[PDB]
């Protein structure tokens, strides 16, 4: 076990790879993961005058955060939500980027708005370059939201033991959005029509959703279904509750979405997977407050 940090890039990427073959993980899937955790205490760091987060992190990147490696989708995107306009988001990424953290800097690329049709703000995309050291290490996509109804009121805490192992003792702790607002956006999303131009191509969200159904265990889905009708009301699209249909395109769109993950129980083909997402609809619905 390394008993200081990593002297340099080479070095850091050398006991990557050393704990990369040790886990069992691929070499890329651990290096993007390491430096999505860099990217996610940059955003830590950025919090309102109370001291609570400005920046809470979603999709892919939670899952992983949640589930390890092992057990959730590869992804690349690191999406947040922010309680900020975004402007202020930007220049307190930079700031933080510059400053750095554990020997790691960032510099971010302009952000650039993106069209969306429910929600008055649009979200903006750009990307970190990150250096460890001096030199560059990996770039990372961004996207960054605005709030929609509770969805920033609570956020649950994720860690990671990566950079522990390769000798970066600090401490990780990244604020991520909770569960109950994860699945409220993913069904809206997945069950979402889309414009004659774009179709929608997201089956992965089958996966996503069978995993958070399963990080629910036995609770009560009342928060659940609160939050779900909350996003299908305020995005004024297609109402609560939705159908899980699949389009023809689908079904190796979702096999790709299972890569890796044969270990564990999840529905293997396209049509068992909108089954059982669409009783899992069926089953929030039916909370009883
Ligand atoms: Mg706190
Ligand atoms: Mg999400
Ligand atoms: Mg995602
Ligand atoms: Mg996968
Ligand atoms: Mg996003
Ligand atoms: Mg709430
Ligand atoms: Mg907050
Ligand atoms: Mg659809
Ligand atoms: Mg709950
Ligand atoms: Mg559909
Ligand atoms: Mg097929
Ligand atoms: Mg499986
Ligand atoms: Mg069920």
Same mark, same amino acid.
């Given at each position: 076990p390394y008993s200081s940090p990593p002297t340099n890039l080479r070095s850091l990427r050398d006991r990557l790879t050393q704990v990369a073959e040790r886990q069992g993980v691929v070499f890329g899937r651990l290096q993007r993961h390491v430096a999505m955790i860099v990217v996610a205490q940059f955003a830590a760091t950025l919090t309102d005058d109370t001291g609570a987060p400005l920046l809470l992190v979603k999709g892919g990147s939670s899952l992983e955060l949640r589930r390890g490696i092992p057990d959730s989708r590869t992804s690349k995107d690191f999406d947040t939500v922010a309680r900020r306009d975004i402007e202020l988001i930007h220049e307190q990424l930079a700031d933080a980027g510059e400053t750095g953290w554990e020997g790691f800097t960032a510099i971010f690329t302009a952000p650039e708005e993106i069209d969306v049709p429910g929600m008055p703000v649009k979200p903006r995309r750009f990307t970190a370059k990150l250096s460890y050291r001096g030199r560059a290490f990996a770039t990372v996509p961004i996207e960054v939201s605005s709030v929609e109804a /509770?969805?920033?009121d609570q956020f649950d805490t994720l860690t990671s033991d990566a950079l522990g192992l390769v000798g970066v003792p600090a401490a990780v702790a990244v604020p991520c959005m909770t569960i109950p607002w994860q699945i409220a956006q993913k069904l809206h999303a997945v069950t979402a029509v889309l414009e004659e131009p774009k179709v929608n191509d997201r089956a992965h969200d089958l996966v996503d959703l069978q995993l958070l159904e399963g990080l629910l265990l036995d609770a009560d889905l009342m928060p659940t279904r609160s939050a779900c009708i909350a996003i299908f009301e305020a995005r004024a699209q297609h109402p609560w509750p939705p159908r899980v249909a699949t389009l023809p395109h689908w079904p190796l769109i979702y096999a790709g979405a299972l890569e /890796?993950?044969?270990?564990l129980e999840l529905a293997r083909t396209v049509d068992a997977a909108a089954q059982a997402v669409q009783r899992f609809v069926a089953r929030i619905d039916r909370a009883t407050k």
């Open positions: /509770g969805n920033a /890796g993950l044969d270990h």
